[PDB]
């Protein structure tokens, strides 16, 4: 499973 | 062998018309098993091997959801990137990310990680310590301070030691009867004439899984590389791989050269001689 990525 | 669950993600701003495309691909031990692809109308995460099709309907609901989230952030990241680097306004650019886990066979985490690249180059990377970031350049420092301030590092660390391990282990069990298999390479040597009385010996390895292999040519003295061409390991496109390694020999002296093939699907290493 993948997660949310922080915005750069 | 240790195992991995990795996601590889790509955002590509299209020039004039189009909006960014977005692609999310995940791999257990380097085999693709789930894909998400922005151009579809029916944009949804999807199974990519037969053993993921066996999965609870709402698995996908969940994953698809996260993908749209991430998709949306990508659009924004691209625009952010543009402004960090002060880039001309009209071009096509790229943001990519990778994160995943390698865990040993005893089930413990070995390495967790998460790296971003902009326009093909390193931007930022979570350190092995799972709590500090490494910026590749001055723009990435802006993000690093953002992420330090946002406690990003803790969220990734929690997921890497948490959800990823749990799911890695759980995907292995699912396609357990395939990702653990081991096909051994079938090797042969071919011969080719050459200007001047020179000879290409080429050592082939075919049908092997997994991809990792070592092909080396020894002039009876163990070590040989000076004038030794070898291609990158390539997929035969049935689940197996291929690779070769060639060496050029003075005509007449072929028999002095041995090829050696190391791969984990072998009782013991092959040696070959013309």
């Amino acid at each position: 499973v993948n997660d949310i990525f922080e915005r750069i | 062998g240790s195992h991995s669950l990795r996601y590889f993600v790509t955002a590509v701003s299209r020039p004039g018309h189009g909006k960014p495309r977005y692609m999310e691909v995940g791999y257990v031990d380097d085999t693709e098993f789930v894909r998400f692809d922005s151009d579809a109308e029916n944009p949804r995460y999807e199974p990519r091997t037969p053993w993921m099709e066996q999965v609870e309907p709402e698995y996908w609901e969940g994953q698809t959801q996260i993908a749209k989230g991430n998709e949306q952030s990508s659009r924004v990241d691209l625009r952010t990137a543009l402004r960090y680097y002060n880039q001309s306004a009209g071009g096509s650019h790229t943001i990519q990310r990778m994160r995943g886990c390698e865990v040993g066979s005893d089930g413990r985490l070995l390495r967790g990680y998460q790296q971003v690249a902009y326009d093909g180059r390193d931007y930022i990377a979570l350190n092995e310590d799972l709590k500090t970031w490494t910026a590749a350049d001055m723009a990435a420092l802006i993000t690093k301070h953002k992420w330090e301030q946002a406690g990003a590092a803790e969220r990734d660390r929690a997921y890497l030691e948490g959800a990823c391990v749990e799911w890695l282990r759980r995907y292995l069990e699912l396609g357990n009867a395939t990702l653990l298999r081991t096909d051994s390479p079938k090797a042969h040597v071919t011969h080719h004439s050459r200007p001047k009385d020179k000879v290409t010996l080429r050592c082939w390895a075919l049908g092997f899984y997994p991809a990792d292999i070592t092909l080396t040519w020894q002039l009876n003295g163990e070590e040989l590389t000076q004038d030794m061409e070898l291609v990158e390991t390539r997929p035969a496109g049935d689940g197996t791989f291929q690779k070769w390694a060639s060496v050029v020999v003075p005509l007449g002296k072929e028999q002095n050269y041995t090829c050696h093939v190391y791969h984990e699907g072998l009782p013991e290493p092959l040696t070959l001689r013309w």
Binding site: - | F8, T10, V12, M23, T94, A117, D119, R121, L206, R234
Partner: protein
């Protein structure tokens, strides 16, 4: 923005024997940016039914694509793979050579 030039290998799934059903791959790797155009040829004509993988990339960030199509080799048929990428001023062709 730095570009990386695609590396091209054309090769078959099984060791070629004239007249023998078989499969032809054109593996393209190590390029960036990801937009690219790939075609497989047979006597200078796009082979109609070519299967192509979707945009993907490697641990070094570089993109790959594998194209393949079923073919059956002979004495009198040449097979190529032509690729067009921004890093190249010209399209680049690579011929299938049975010994590679």
């Amino acid at each position: 923005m730095i570009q990386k030039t695609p590396q091209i290998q054309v090769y078959s799934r099984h060791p070629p024997e004239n007249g023998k059903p078989n499969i032809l791959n054109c593996y393209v790797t190590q390029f960036h940016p990801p937009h690219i155009e790939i075609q497989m040829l047979k006597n200078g004509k796009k082979i109609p039914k070519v299967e192509m993988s979707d945009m993907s990339f490697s641990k070094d960030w570089s993109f790959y694509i594998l194209a393949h199509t079923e073919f059956t080799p002979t004495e009198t048929d040449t097979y190529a793979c032509r690729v067009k990428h921004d890093s190249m001023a010209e399209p680049k062709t690579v011929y299938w050579d049975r010994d590679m």
